[PDB]
Amino acid sequence: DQLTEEQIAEFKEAFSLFDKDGDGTITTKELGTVMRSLGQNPTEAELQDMINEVDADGNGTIDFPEFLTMMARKMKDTDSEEEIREAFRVFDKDGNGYISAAELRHVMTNLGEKLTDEEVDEMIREADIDGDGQVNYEEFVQMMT
Amino acid sequence: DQLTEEQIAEFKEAFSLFDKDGDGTITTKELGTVMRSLGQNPTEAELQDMINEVDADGNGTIDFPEFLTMMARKMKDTDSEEEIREAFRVFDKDGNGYISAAELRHVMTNLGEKLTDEEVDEMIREADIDGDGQVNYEEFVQMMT
Amino acid sequence: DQLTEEQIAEFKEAFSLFDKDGDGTITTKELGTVMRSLGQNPTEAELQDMINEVDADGNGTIDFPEFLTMMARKMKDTDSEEEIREAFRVFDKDGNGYISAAELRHVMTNLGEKLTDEEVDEMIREADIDGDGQVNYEEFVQMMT
Amino acid sequence: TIQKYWRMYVVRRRYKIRRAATIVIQSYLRGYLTRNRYRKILREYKAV
């Protein structure tokens, strides 16, 4: 059941990493960071939807209860457990369950919300890639879960 | 594992500061103070688990051979020169070992097993904690020996 | 009653240097003097306690049986020189059997109840000390016995 | 759909690392403060 006291404590600790006065507010830039630190799973465009209620150019400020209000609705949304398999199904090399490294560069750096260079490095080191290559998506979903 | 004379002597070099009448037994609450004085660095939860590994009452008393029987079952390692360095590596300024003192004060008061205001009074008086500067972690570990 | 006739005689003989009238009563001013003479090593605060245990307003005067009762309060303590050899080990740099003259000066005049200027002068003269060096605690406890 | 999940994974991981590291540093510091009080008390007591 929602909102036993200890839930609010755990979520407020994660927020208290980012506030540097103790006034209960953060910059809008770190809203995605606190949310994903707790393992909540929104898109960039889904964060942008909320930020249009509060920010003049992407450099504003936002209270703990505003963040927690967005989180309260996102905590009833689905875990994407079916959705991530439907996504990876598209990028299989031959239908045996294995994503190609070539397609994966287009998935990282061209399609959708993309990834920046120094965190594409992270996925290359996670996958042990020194040339042409591949990865099983059921295993990779299990690892990202 | 089994235990040896010089280690048992060092364990009593801590314990006999607290066994004030030489009873050979202490009320179990003080065991955390003894073990931290002895150079192990466990959490409260690990002190509770090391009590759980011998079925013991935290509100009772613990005689010295039963304490040595716990030490022969001891499960949490907490003395390693490398483990504490791994913890500092994520706070490095550029890869040359520098730690921002003000940021460390913020994080240690707002995340994890947080420092209280009276512990900050004590820490100021007894660890000389800078509010303007920075410290290189290699020396800083060996200052806290 | 806690002393043999031989023990009572020994303590009465010594007490009769500080009682000066033979009526069986001492001034509180020499109470420390007679106890320190009769093998005891009482702290300043322990002399204060033992007087205020008898009377907290009083008259600066104590009966011989009440003095023997202060000796009885001490004589339970299993006091012997090996724990004193161990006391100096806490101030040894090498384990060589040696305390530095600087650390000894700090020990005597910063920590604890504290020796006075003349108690230091008197001890230095008796000890055959020469220069701000180091002093062997095995030999010194042999002299202190 | 993959990009949201990877953003979650790496941030959640770096939060766990920093929270664990913080707890380790707090534990080592409470270790030091205990050892300093022990060293002071012991010296005072043996000096007397």
Going from N- to C-terminal start, the domains of chain C cover 3-77, 78-145
CB contact under 8 A, C87 and D48: no
Distance from CA of A121 to the nearest CA of D (A): 12
Angle between helices D2-47 and A44-51 (to 10 degrees): 80
CA distance B54 to B114: 29
CA distance B92 to B104: 11
Contacts of B45 (CB under 8 A, 6+ apart): none
Domain topology for B3-77 = Recoverin; domain 1 (1.10.238)
Scan for tokens 């002393």, then name that residue.
Answer: C3
3-state secondary structure of C60: coil
3-state secondary structure of B89: helix
CB contact under 8 A, A42 and D4: yes
Give the residue from chain D lying closest to A145, CA to CA. D9
| Cβ contact C40:C79 at 8 Å | no
| Cβ contact C19:C39 at 8 Å | no
- What's the token pair of residue A22? 């103790």
Distance from CA of B57 to the nearest CA of D (A): 23
Report chain A's C-alpha Rg in angstroms: 18
Resolution in angstroms, to 1 decimal, for this deposition? 7.5
C91 touching D (Cβ < 8 Å): yes
Task: Say which experimental method was used.
Answer: cryo-EM
Any binding-site annotation on C126? no
Read out DSSP for C11-47? HHHHHTTTS-SSSSEEEGGGHHHHHHHTT----HHHH
3-state secondary structure of A59: coil
Scan for tokens 């949201």, then name that residue.
Answer: D4
Domain topology for A78-145 = Recoverin; domain 1 (1.10.238)
Residue from A120, A126, A100, A90 nearest A108 by CA: A120
Degrees to nearest 5, angle at CA B75 with B70 and B78: 110
Q: Which of A11, A13, A23 to mutate to test the interface with B (most CBs of B within 10 A)?
A: A13
| Cβ contact A47:A79 at 8 Å | no
Instruction: Tell me how far the alpha carbon of residue C76 is from its chain's centroid.
Output: 16
Q: Which of B91, B106, B107, B117 to mutate to test the interface with A (most CBs of A within 10 A)?
A: B106
| Cβ contact A21:A64 at 8 Å | no
CA distance D38 to B17: 8
CB contact under 8 A, C91 and D46: yes
Distance from CA of A23 to the nearest CA of B (A): 13
Which residues does residue A99 pair with via DSSP β-bridges, in sequence order? A92, A135
- The enclosing H or E element of A62 equals strand A61-63
CA distance B90 to B108: 14
Give the residue from chain D lying closest to B40, CA to CA. D31
CA distance D31 to B80: 13
| Cβ contact A26:A18 at 8 Å | yes
Query: Rounded to 5 degrees, what are φ and ψ at B115?
Result: -75, 130
D33 touching A (Cβ < 8 Å): no
